[PDB]
């Protein structure tokens, strides 16, 4: 897999080469140490036991050289593991801010969470706990086959021909094991799809006083499915048994060949026994690769997730009121269209309202204006300058926004407000508190704006969260302002804060609002009704109301709902 | 594990047989490494080819025997477990039909899928894979150890020098990082939460930026530096910890311990041969015990969770349309009341609403009236009978409810509204939908009322909520319970939902969780709750004249 070589920094190319060369040295040294058993054990079992000392001397010198080069490889492995951990994490942290928000799907977000968080202990020890064993046990059988080739070319051929056979055996065992486990998990999941359906709706069934028929139905389905589920099991039989049989029939075949040559006279008894021992050392590395299959699989999954983070589509790159322009803009998650033929050119200093049902892309429009994403089609410009083609400083300092969620970062209230402009003076903070109605919360808080408002610090309700979110956008000196809110009647300070914010903000800048309620989008100079991602109406509030279009019917229905109450008509 | 052991009670006898069959297979798969020693003995003795062929047939026969036993035991264990899985899936089905209805709205606990699907797969792998693996991984090293001890106790005991060194190094690396080891899982979870916040809070960093990006990167760098400072000093320990177990070191120490004995004539050269065959990979064997036993805990946790689900309390039955409440006290956690001494009575046919600050037991009280739970003290008497004495057939015929999170049911719209009375005709369902202001949309569907509903469909949240309201029409009760948030959860369908919920409310002892203070202007009764206790009781005008909590709250909005 080429990903692991991509993760390593350019600094440590002097450690990658010095790791690969020393790993090859350790592999060749292990192969020589295994092959040195031939004269050693030949002298051991023969009628000259003392002759084996010299080959024991060579073996122990070989072992100490292996100790030194293995220490070097493991030290460089740990050091390169820390280096690649730092490189991977910092590249992820430098990538994701530049990753377009389209990439952050729920599954992609989950994989990014795992990559940032769960891949800590792994990358600190991938190259030392996986690559060193794997590479040192994958190249040792072939290395011993090569080494025996210098003792007898037919013997080396006999050893090396089995390496391909046994690697094919390992591949077959892995396939037939993991596929069997996949099938087992699939069957277990499919059987339990009934119980999920029952459990989710069992309150609705109880309200319908029909729980017993549903339970009987699901039990009958379970019994019927299990009746066929307890027959015809074949797949897992050649699983681990397949490799456990391959790595024993190979041993018996090679030992039988050795003794066949012994009776044939080409070899002596000591040579036959020593060759049996070496042809057992030939087989032991295949066990280690089998034991590394789960760790290798998990590391392969984590490296795939890290490559997903490191391959997300990044956004390319290239103080009065600006003009924000839209030209045939479209956006879609998959094939589901969110925006369809949207075009506008809002003049500087204007105030506009983007309204419509939740199926439209109002927040999509605001995020595209703010430069959170590259639009799927069309062009979004700042006075003719495409948002993606700005310097990062200009792009970040171009637009101020109030999100649907509050997105409080668990800091203090002053910290929660000052992210709009940390360089601003306390007077601007006071103006933000006055307009956003958070001063009512300052009346409650002990320390005021310095009080911690974290999740464990203060249990702020939705109204306080949205008011401080409004203050965030108010504080920033961005030449463009946007607002999308989910204000309700739960806390009436929310709409008052919004009304004061979008009106009393003294700075000159383009403003946009997205909201559902009535009697507050009056202050917007223009209106852009959107249906299913396409603009259907345009004009002022009163203009559209007089026109008697979709906006008028929406106004009438929401007015009827607002005046409604419980207890009578 | 007590709960896990109790769950696995009916599998003890088969699993004991598995733990013997696999212990046998493990020995049979190590048998040829004994017959190779025998073969070396014969070749030293120079036996004729007939005895050689006899031993070669013995070895291949044992290999076939051990390859057939594993297949047979796998086949048998995959049908031992496959019927216990059916028994468990059929037992959880009965348990799910007897839990309190608030159990499925639990918080701080595993999801239903994580409780019934994943915890059954991790039990299937506890029985069929992990117990065979974990008995094999203990039989193999211990059988190898005892065989090598039989061969020669001298070179056998020398195998423990690297094992002792490895254990000493692991212990020394553990004691010097006890605080760090304790902190590491906690820091991992904390950084997982921080990464989640950095990801869901991405737009603020993207637009506002500044302190947020630097703060997240600072926390990530602090975690990285914590890991590096933790494990960098132990590289000296952790490298020499790996060489000691490597097969090359085992081979070298085997030969250094044996070759002097062979040359000095203190042990026959064939007694050394078993160590060469088997004792080289002995280090990598004991390192497999830990991974083997690690596969039992992962499934024992799942068994514990499913048994915990099976041990939950059940919806017990003990022993004029007027809902009553007397000394109602309810505790979520042990000794943590949220409702405290609530006494209330609702006259028949009166639309009643209760208000208060968010998070004051209002929805909990409404659910308790609906019997999603049972009060610790007091009693809710509907028509003079305590709710605890009525069955699910009787109580839920007297007290219907449409709370939040409306649930669709399998089948078409005709058999989704008529769950209470499936014998009802299509015309009754159609007029119920007309009353529920949902007949207009259902007719626009391509299949009309034959459109199949279930886990998901083309209907929005408000539309399925209206379908559940229409179902509540057919489930006629003198009493009802509701949540006002459903009245405006869908802004597009808010008006139709309001008309539908009002039409359902007509001439019924309806209780509502009221949040918008202006919606109770002409209700039949109003009540206020504070920290689980009553503060204000009266109608709209009476509480307006009171000037208390309700007046202050409404003057704020
Ligand atoms: N496939 C999707 N995954 C996640 N979010 C989506 C998807 N499709 C649409 N959205 C959300 O819908 C919004 C656009 O719709 P909008 O009209 O703003 O809805 P709302 O009225 O609820 O704000 C976007 O901000 C986006 O977050
Ligand atoms: N498991 C629990 N589920 C819900 N609320 C709980 C639980 N345990 C304790 N509580 C307390 O009970 C109160 C119930 O709040 P509630 O009025 O139901 O909120 P909502 O009106 O949003 O449903 C909460 O404020 C909470 O502090
Ligand atoms: Zn299986």
Short mmCIF file of N, CA and C in Angstrom, two decimals, chain A residues 30 37 44-45 49 53 59-60 63 70-71 78 89-90 93-94 96-97 99 101 104 113 181 188 191-192 195-196 199-204 206 208-210 215 217-219 222 226 230 236-237 241 245 248 251 259 273 277 280-281 284 357 370 372 396 399 401 403 407 472 476 490 492 558 561 564 566-568, chain B residues 29 32-33 36 44 52 59 67 70-71 78-79 82-83 86 89 93 96-97 99 101 104 116 120 125 129 192 196 199-200 202-204 206-208 217 221 224 238-239 243 246-248 252 255 262-263 269 273 276-277 280-281 315 351 393 407-408 410 419-420 422 455 471 491-492 498 502 515 519 522-523 557:
data_model
loop_
_atom_site.label_atom_id
_atom_site.label_comp_id
_atom_site.label_asym_id
_atom_site.label_seq_id
_atom_site.Cartn_x
_atom_site.Cartn_y
_atom_site.Cartn_z
N UNK A 30 18.76 -13.11 9.15
CA UNK A 30 17.93 -14.19 9.68
C UNK A 30 17.95 -15.40 8.75
N UNK A 37 22.16 -23.51 10.12
CA UNK A 37 21.86 -24.74 10.83
C UNK A 37 22.30 -25.97 10.04
N UNK A 44 26.45 -31.63 14.32
CA UNK A 44 25.87 -32.00 15.61
C UNK A 44 25.42 -33.45 15.62
N UNK A 45 24.69 -33.88 14.59
CA UNK A 45 24.15 -35.24 14.55
C UNK A 45 25.15 -36.28 14.06
N UNK A 49 30.80 -34.50 16.94
CA UNK A 49 30.04 -33.43 17.59
C UNK A 49 30.82 -32.14 17.78
N UNK A 53 31.21 -26.47 16.83
CA UNK A 53 31.53 -25.25 17.56
C UNK A 53 31.79 -24.08 16.62
N UNK A 59 27.26 -18.64 14.05
CA UNK A 59 25.87 -18.38 14.37
C UNK A 59 25.72 -17.29 15.43
N UNK A 60 26.56 -17.31 16.46
CA UNK A 60 26.42 -16.31 17.52
C UNK A 60 26.89 -14.94 17.04
N UNK A 63 24.02 -13.74 15.18
CA UNK A 63 22.93 -13.32 16.05
C UNK A 63 23.20 -11.95 16.66
N UNK A 70 18.71 -5.04 14.33
CA UNK A 70 17.32 -4.99 14.75
C UNK A 70 17.07 -3.85 15.73
N UNK A 71 18.03 -3.58 16.63
CA UNK A 71 17.92 -2.42 17.50
C UNK A 71 17.87 -1.14 16.68
N UNK A 78 10.45 3.52 15.77
CA UNK A 78 9.75 4.36 16.74
C UNK A 78 9.89 5.84 16.40
N UNK A 89 -1.14 14.08 11.59
CA UNK A 89 -2.09 14.89 12.33
C UNK A 89 -2.04 16.35 11.90
N UNK A 90 -0.85 16.90 11.67
CA UNK A 90 -0.76 18.29 11.27
C UNK A 90 -1.27 18.49 9.85
N UNK A 93 -4.99 18.54 10.19
CA UNK A 93 -5.46 19.80 10.76
C UNK A 93 -5.31 20.95 9.78
N UNK A 94 -4.34 20.88 8.87
CA UNK A 94 -4.19 21.89 7.82
C UNK A 94 -5.05 21.62 6.60
N UNK A 96 -8.45 19.87 6.72
CA UNK A 96 -9.89 19.94 6.98
C UNK A 96 -10.45 21.36 6.99
N UNK A 97 -9.78 22.37 7.55
CA UNK A 97 -10.29 23.75 7.39
C UNK A 97 -10.43 24.17 5.94
N UNK A 99 -11.01 21.93 3.53
CA UNK A 99 -11.92 20.99 2.90
C UNK A 99 -13.30 21.63 2.78
N UNK A 101 -17.27 22.09 2.71
CA UNK A 101 -18.25 21.55 3.64
C UNK A 101 -19.10 20.45 3.01
N UNK A 104 -18.25 16.91 4.30
CA UNK A 104 -18.62 16.53 5.67
C UNK A 104 -20.04 15.94 5.69
N UNK A 113 -13.76 11.97 12.36
CA UNK A 113 -13.64 11.88 13.81
C UNK A 113 -12.69 10.75 14.20
N UNK A 181 -16.88 -14.76 7.83
CA UNK A 181 -17.30 -13.86 8.89
C UNK A 181 -18.26 -12.79 8.37
N UNK A 188 -26.74 -12.61 10.75
CA UNK A 188 -27.16 -12.18 12.08
C UNK A 188 -27.91 -10.85 12.01
N UNK A 191 -31.52 -11.28 10.42
CA UNK A 191 -32.50 -11.90 11.31
C UNK A 191 -33.09 -10.87 12.28
N UNK A 192 -32.28 -9.91 12.72
CA UNK A 192 -32.68 -8.95 13.73
C UNK A 192 -33.31 -7.69 13.15
N UNK A 195 -36.77 -7.22 14.81
CA UNK A 195 -36.84 -6.76 16.19
C UNK A 195 -36.63 -5.26 16.27
N UNK A 196 -35.80 -4.70 15.39
CA UNK A 196 -35.62 -3.25 15.36
C UNK A 196 -36.94 -2.57 15.00
N UNK A 199 -39.23 -2.82 18.01
CA UNK A 199 -38.84 -2.02 19.17
C UNK A 199 -39.06 -0.54 18.93
N UNK A 200 -38.78 -0.06 17.72
CA UNK A 200 -38.94 1.36 17.43
C UNK A 200 -40.39 1.78 17.59
N UNK A 201 -41.32 0.97 17.09
CA UNK A 201 -42.73 1.33 17.03
C UNK A 201 -43.55 0.73 18.16
N UNK A 202 -42.92 0.06 19.13
CA UNK A 202 -43.70 -0.63 20.15
C UNK A 202 -44.49 0.31 21.05
N UNK A 203 -44.14 1.60 21.10
CA UNK A 203 -44.99 2.56 21.79
C UNK A 203 -46.24 2.87 20.98
N UNK A 204 -46.08 3.02 19.67
CA UNK A 204 -47.24 3.26 18.80
C UNK A 204 -48.19 2.07 18.82
N UNK A 206 -48.50 -0.06 21.31
CA UNK A 206 -49.13 -0.08 22.63
C UNK A 206 -50.27 0.93 22.70
N UNK A 208 -52.05 1.66 20.26
CA UNK A 208 -53.08 1.02 19.46
C UNK A 208 -53.59 -0.28 20.08
N UNK A 209 -53.15 -0.62 21.30
CA UNK A 209 -53.51 -1.85 22.02
C UNK A 209 -53.46 -3.07 21.10
N UNK A 210 -52.37 -3.16 20.33
CA UNK A 210 -52.15 -4.21 19.35
C UNK A 210 -50.75 -4.80 19.47
N UNK A 215 -46.11 -8.89 18.26
CA UNK A 215 -45.11 -9.77 18.85
C UNK A 215 -45.23 -11.18 18.30
N UNK A 217 -46.44 -12.06 15.38
CA UNK A 217 -45.98 -12.03 13.99
C UNK A 217 -44.46 -12.07 13.92
N UNK A 218 -43.79 -11.25 14.74
CA UNK A 218 -42.33 -11.19 14.67
C UNK A 218 -41.73 -12.50 15.17
N UNK A 219 -42.32 -13.10 16.20
CA UNK A 219 -41.84 -14.39 16.67
C UNK A 219 -42.01 -15.48 15.63
N UNK A 222 -39.32 -15.01 13.10
CA UNK A 222 -38.05 -15.51 13.61
C UNK A 222 -37.98 -17.03 13.54
N UNK A 226 -35.36 -19.07 11.22
CA UNK A 226 -34.40 -19.95 11.87
C UNK A 226 -34.57 -21.40 11.42
N UNK A 230 -30.81 -23.13 10.22
CA UNK A 230 -30.06 -24.20 10.86
C UNK A 230 -29.72 -25.33 9.90
N UNK A 236 -17.27 -21.76 6.22
CA UNK A 236 -16.16 -21.54 7.14
C UNK A 236 -15.30 -22.78 7.36
N UNK A 237 -15.69 -23.94 6.84
CA UNK A 237 -14.95 -25.18 7.07
C UNK A 237 -13.52 -25.04 6.55
N UNK A 241 -8.66 -23.83 9.17
CA UNK A 241 -8.29 -25.22 8.95
C UNK A 241 -7.52 -25.36 7.65
N UNK A 245 -3.83 -26.92 7.65
CA UNK A 245 -3.55 -28.14 6.90
C UNK A 245 -2.46 -27.90 5.86
N UNK A 248 1.09 -27.93 7.31
CA UNK A 248 1.47 -29.22 7.86
C UNK A 248 1.68 -30.25 6.76
N UNK A 251 4.97 -29.35 5.36
CA UNK A 251 6.04 -29.87 6.19
C UNK A 251 6.26 -31.35 5.94
N UNK A 259 13.82 -37.35 3.15
CA UNK A 259 14.16 -38.74 3.47
C UNK A 259 14.14 -39.61 2.21
N UNK A 273 18.34 -34.51 8.51
CA UNK A 273 17.75 -33.96 9.72
C UNK A 273 17.92 -32.44 9.76
N UNK A 277 15.01 -29.47 9.86
CA UNK A 277 14.93 -28.35 10.79
C UNK A 277 14.87 -27.02 10.04
N UNK A 280 11.64 -26.45 8.46
CA UNK A 280 10.70 -25.98 9.47
C UNK A 280 10.88 -24.50 9.77
N UNK A 281 12.12 -24.00 9.85
CA UNK A 281 12.33 -22.55 9.93
C UNK A 281 11.79 -21.85 8.69
N UNK A 284 7.90 -21.38 9.66
CA UNK A 284 7.46 -20.56 10.79
C UNK A 284 7.08 -19.13 10.40
N UNK A 357 -39.82 27.28 2.15
CA UNK A 357 -39.91 26.08 2.99
C UNK A 357 -38.54 25.49 3.25
N UNK A 370 -21.16 33.08 1.88
CA UNK A 370 -20.09 33.18 2.86
C UNK A 370 -18.82 32.45 2.43
N UNK A 372 -18.36 29.07 2.19
CA UNK A 372 -18.13 27.79 2.84
C UNK A 372 -17.89 26.66 1.85
N UNK A 396 -11.83 35.11 4.73
CA UNK A 396 -12.30 35.01 6.11
C UNK A 396 -12.88 36.34 6.59
N UNK A 399 -17.17 38.15 5.07
CA UNK A 399 -18.57 37.91 5.42
C UNK A 399 -18.69 37.60 6.90
N UNK A 401 -21.77 36.06 9.66
CA UNK A 401 -22.94 35.19 9.55
C UNK A 401 -23.45 34.82 10.94
N UNK A 403 -25.48 31.54 12.28
CA UNK A 403 -25.83 30.21 11.81
C UNK A 403 -27.16 29.75 12.38
N UNK A 407 -23.48 27.17 17.75
CA UNK A 407 -22.07 26.81 17.61
C UNK A 407 -21.21 27.50 18.67
N UNK A 472 -22.18 37.77 18.06
CA UNK A 472 -20.96 37.40 17.34
C UNK A 472 -20.92 38.06 15.97
N UNK A 476 -18.36 41.59 14.43
CA UNK A 476 -17.34 41.49 13.40
C UNK A 476 -17.46 42.68 12.43
N UNK A 490 -40.63 30.57 22.34
CA UNK A 490 -40.20 30.05 23.63
C UNK A 490 -39.54 31.13 24.48
N UNK A 492 -39.06 35.23 24.01
CA UNK A 492 -39.37 36.38 23.18
C UNK A 492 -38.21 37.36 23.07
N UNK A 558 -49.75 31.84 8.31
CA UNK A 558 -48.99 32.03 9.54
C UNK A 558 -49.65 33.05 10.46
N UNK A 561 -52.27 31.03 12.19
CA UNK A 561 -51.65 30.18 13.21
C UNK A 561 -51.22 30.99 14.42
N UNK A 564 -53.85 31.86 16.90
CA UNK A 564 -54.56 30.70 17.41
C UNK A 564 -54.14 30.42 18.85
N UNK A 566 -55.38 27.50 22.44
CA UNK A 566 -55.92 26.21 22.85
C UNK A 566 -57.02 26.44 23.87
N UNK A 567 -58.12 25.70 23.72
CA UNK A 567 -59.28 25.80 24.59
C UNK A 567 -60.58 26.08 23.86
N UNK A 568 -60.51 26.68 22.68
CA UNK A 568 -61.69 27.00 21.89
C UNK A 568 -61.25 27.16 20.44
N UNK B 29 -2.86 -31.00 15.83
CA UNK B 29 -2.13 -30.17 14.87
C UNK B 29 -0.67 -29.96 15.27
N UNK B 32 2.38 -33.85 14.34
CA UNK B 32 3.46 -34.14 13.38
C UNK B 32 4.83 -33.65 13.79
N UNK B 33 4.92 -32.60 14.62
CA UNK B 33 6.21 -32.19 15.14
C UNK B 33 6.76 -33.16 16.18
N UNK B 36 8.08 -36.05 13.52
CA UNK B 36 9.35 -35.70 12.91
C UNK B 36 10.52 -36.04 13.83
N UNK B 44 18.42 -42.04 12.55
CA UNK B 44 19.61 -42.36 13.33
C UNK B 44 19.75 -43.86 13.52
N UNK B 52 9.45 -46.59 7.86
CA UNK B 52 9.37 -45.21 7.41
C UNK B 52 8.01 -44.92 6.79
N UNK B 59 1.51 -40.00 10.20
CA UNK B 59 1.47 -38.54 10.23
C UNK B 59 0.36 -37.98 9.35
N UNK B 67 -7.80 -32.30 10.63
CA UNK B 67 -8.49 -31.42 9.70
C UNK B 67 -9.97 -31.75 9.58
N UNK B 70 -11.76 -30.40 13.13
CA UNK B 70 -12.04 -28.97 13.14
C UNK B 70 -13.26 -28.63 12.31
N UNK B 71 -13.40 -29.25 11.13
CA UNK B 71 -14.58 -29.00 10.31
C UNK B 71 -15.85 -29.48 10.99
N UNK B 78 -21.63 -24.14 15.02
CA UNK B 78 -22.46 -23.18 14.29
C UNK B 78 -23.93 -23.57 14.25
N UNK B 79 -24.32 -24.76 14.74
CA UNK B 79 -25.73 -25.09 14.95
C UNK B 79 -26.08 -25.16 16.43
N UNK B 82 -26.50 -21.33 16.60
CA UNK B 82 -27.53 -20.80 15.73
C UNK B 82 -28.93 -20.97 16.30
N UNK B 83 -29.14 -21.91 17.23
CA UNK B 83 -30.44 -22.05 17.88
C UNK B 83 -30.51 -21.29 19.19
N UNK B 86 -31.51 -17.95 18.03
CA UNK B 86 -32.95 -17.87 17.82
C UNK B 86 -33.69 -17.74 19.15
N UNK B 89 -33.17 -14.16 20.39
CA UNK B 89 -33.91 -13.18 19.60
C UNK B 89 -35.40 -13.29 19.84
N UNK B 93 -37.69 -10.42 22.14
CA UNK B 93 -38.95 -9.98 21.56
C UNK B 93 -40.04 -9.90 22.62
N UNK B 96 -39.18 -6.95 25.10
CA UNK B 96 -39.46 -5.62 24.56
C UNK B 96 -40.93 -5.26 24.67
N UNK B 97 -41.82 -6.25 24.69
CA UNK B 97 -43.25 -6.02 24.81
C UNK B 97 -43.71 -5.87 26.25
N UNK B 99 -41.41 -3.87 28.65
CA UNK B 99 -40.66 -2.79 29.28
C UNK B 99 -41.57 -1.58 29.47
N UNK B 101 -42.71 2.11 28.74
CA UNK B 101 -42.60 2.81 27.47
C UNK B 101 -41.57 3.92 27.51
N UNK B 104 -37.62 3.18 26.22
CA UNK B 104 -37.17 3.42 24.86
C UNK B 104 -36.83 4.89 24.60
N UNK B 116 -29.30 -4.91 20.50
CA UNK B 116 -29.97 -6.12 20.00
C UNK B 116 -29.24 -6.71 18.80
N UNK B 120 -25.58 -9.10 19.85
CA UNK B 120 -25.81 -10.48 19.46
C UNK B 120 -24.75 -11.01 18.51
N UNK B 125 -19.85 -14.37 17.99
CA UNK B 125 -18.40 -14.51 17.96
C UNK B 125 -17.81 -14.87 19.31
N UNK B 129 -16.40 -18.40 17.59
CA UNK B 129 -15.02 -18.09 17.22
C UNK B 129 -14.14 -17.87 18.44
N UNK B 192 -11.48 12.93 21.32
CA UNK B 192 -12.58 12.56 20.44
C UNK B 192 -13.71 13.56 20.50
N UNK B 196 -14.91 16.07 17.54
CA UNK B 196 -16.31 16.18 17.16
C UNK B 196 -16.80 17.61 17.16
N UNK B 199 -15.39 19.49 14.28
CA UNK B 199 -16.00 19.11 13.01
C UNK B 199 -17.41 19.67 12.86
N UNK B 200 -18.28 19.47 13.85
CA UNK B 200 -19.62 20.04 13.76
C UNK B 200 -19.60 21.55 13.89
N UNK B 202 -17.43 23.41 12.48
CA UNK B 202 -16.57 23.86 11.39
C UNK B 202 -16.93 25.24 10.85
N UNK B 203 -18.20 25.57 10.56
CA UNK B 203 -18.48 26.85 9.89
C UNK B 203 -18.01 28.08 10.66
N UNK B 204 -18.08 28.07 11.99
CA UNK B 204 -17.59 29.20 12.77
C UNK B 204 -16.09 29.37 12.55
N UNK B 206 -14.47 28.37 9.95
CA UNK B 206 -14.25 28.72 8.55
C UNK B 206 -14.46 30.21 8.31
N UNK B 207 -15.49 30.79 8.93
CA UNK B 207 -15.86 32.18 8.67
C UNK B 207 -15.25 33.09 9.72
N UNK B 208 -15.68 32.93 10.98
CA UNK B 208 -15.14 33.76 12.04
C UNK B 208 -13.67 33.44 12.28
N UNK B 217 -6.17 23.32 17.16
CA UNK B 217 -4.84 22.84 16.80
C UNK B 217 -3.94 22.77 18.03
N UNK B 221 -2.14 19.42 19.26
CA UNK B 221 -0.71 19.39 19.52
C UNK B 221 -0.40 19.01 20.96
N UNK B 224 -0.76 15.25 21.00
CA UNK B 224 0.38 14.64 20.32
C UNK B 224 1.62 14.71 21.19
N UNK B 238 11.22 -0.41 24.97
CA UNK B 238 10.25 -1.06 24.08
C UNK B 238 10.90 -1.67 22.84
N UNK B 239 12.15 -1.31 22.52
CA UNK B 239 12.86 -1.99 21.43
C UNK B 239 13.48 -3.29 21.92
N UNK B 243 13.06 -7.60 20.80
CA UNK B 243 14.12 -8.51 20.38
C UNK B 243 14.13 -9.77 21.23
N UNK B 246 11.84 -12.38 19.80
CA UNK B 246 11.92 -12.69 18.38
C UNK B 246 12.38 -14.14 18.20
N UNK B 247 11.92 -14.84 17.15
CA UNK B 247 12.35 -16.24 16.99
C UNK B 247 13.85 -16.42 16.84
N UNK B 248 14.56 -15.43 16.30
CA UNK B 248 16.00 -15.57 16.15
C UNK B 248 16.71 -15.65 17.50
N UNK B 252 18.87 -18.79 18.92
CA UNK B 252 20.24 -18.66 19.40
C UNK B 252 20.38 -19.18 20.83
N UNK B 255 20.21 -22.98 20.89
CA UNK B 255 21.44 -23.62 20.44
C UNK B 255 22.56 -23.43 21.45
N UNK B 262 25.17 -31.36 23.78
CA UNK B 262 25.38 -32.40 22.78
C UNK B 262 26.86 -32.73 22.65
N UNK B 263 27.70 -31.70 22.53
CA UNK B 263 29.13 -31.94 22.34
C UNK B 263 29.72 -32.60 23.58
N UNK B 269 21.44 -36.01 20.79
CA UNK B 269 21.17 -34.92 19.84
C UNK B 269 19.74 -34.90 19.33
N UNK B 273 16.06 -31.80 19.27
CA UNK B 273 15.30 -31.55 18.06
C UNK B 273 13.89 -31.00 18.31
N UNK B 276 14.02 -27.22 18.53
CA UNK B 276 14.18 -26.61 17.22
C UNK B 276 12.87 -26.61 16.45
N UNK B 277 12.11 -27.70 16.53
CA UNK B 277 10.85 -27.75 15.80
C UNK B 277 9.83 -26.76 16.36
N UNK B 280 11.12 -22.61 19.00
CA UNK B 280 11.54 -21.36 18.40
C UNK B 280 10.42 -20.33 18.41
N UNK B 281 9.21 -20.74 18.02
CA UNK B 281 8.06 -19.86 18.01
C UNK B 281 7.33 -19.80 19.35
N UNK B 315 -43.74 -3.53 33.28
CA UNK B 315 -44.90 -2.68 33.49
C UNK B 315 -45.91 -3.47 34.32
N UNK B 351 -60.19 21.01 28.58
CA UNK B 351 -58.87 21.09 27.97
C UNK B 351 -57.95 21.78 28.97
N UNK B 393 -54.55 -3.17 27.60
CA UNK B 393 -55.79 -3.15 26.82
C UNK B 393 -56.79 -2.16 27.38
N UNK B 407 -44.46 7.88 15.35
CA UNK B 407 -43.89 6.66 14.79
C UNK B 407 -44.82 6.11 13.72
N UNK B 408 -44.29 5.92 12.52
CA UNK B 408 -45.02 5.20 11.49
C UNK B 408 -44.99 3.70 11.78
N UNK B 410 -45.68 -0.36 9.88
CA UNK B 410 -45.66 -1.08 8.61
C UNK B 410 -47.09 -1.29 8.10
N UNK B 419 -54.99 1.07 13.45
CA UNK B 419 -54.31 0.10 14.31
C UNK B 419 -55.17 -0.24 15.52
N UNK B 420 -55.87 0.74 16.08
CA UNK B 420 -56.74 0.48 17.22
C UNK B 420 -57.88 -0.45 16.84
N UNK B 422 -58.58 -2.42 13.48
CA UNK B 422 -58.33 -2.83 12.08
C UNK B 422 -59.58 -3.23 11.32
N UNK B 455 -40.38 2.28 8.07
CA UNK B 455 -39.24 3.00 8.63
C UNK B 455 -39.10 4.38 8.01
N UNK B 471 -54.76 8.36 13.66
CA UNK B 471 -54.84 7.11 14.41
C UNK B 471 -55.44 7.34 15.79
N UNK B 491 -43.59 24.02 10.48
CA UNK B 491 -44.21 25.32 10.13
C UNK B 491 -45.12 25.28 8.92
N UNK B 492 -44.77 24.50 7.90
CA UNK B 492 -45.59 24.45 6.69
C UNK B 492 -46.95 23.82 6.97
N UNK B 498 -52.66 22.18 13.69
CA UNK B 498 -53.43 22.82 14.75
C UNK B 498 -54.92 22.48 14.63
N UNK B 502 -56.84 20.15 17.41
CA UNK B 502 -58.03 20.69 18.06
C UNK B 502 -59.24 19.80 17.83
N UNK B 515 -46.04 25.40 26.17
CA UNK B 515 -44.83 26.21 26.17
C UNK B 515 -45.10 27.65 25.79
N UNK B 519 -51.00 30.54 24.13
CA UNK B 519 -51.90 29.50 23.66
C UNK B 519 -52.88 29.02 24.72
N UNK B 522 -57.70 30.87 26.61
CA UNK B 522 -59.06 30.41 26.87
C UNK B 522 -59.12 28.91 27.14
N UNK B 523 -58.06 28.36 27.74
CA UNK B 523 -58.10 26.98 28.18
C UNK B 523 -58.98 26.86 29.43
N UNK B 557 -42.68 38.25 27.44
CA UNK B 557 -42.93 37.94 26.05
C UNK B 557 -44.37 38.17 25.64
#
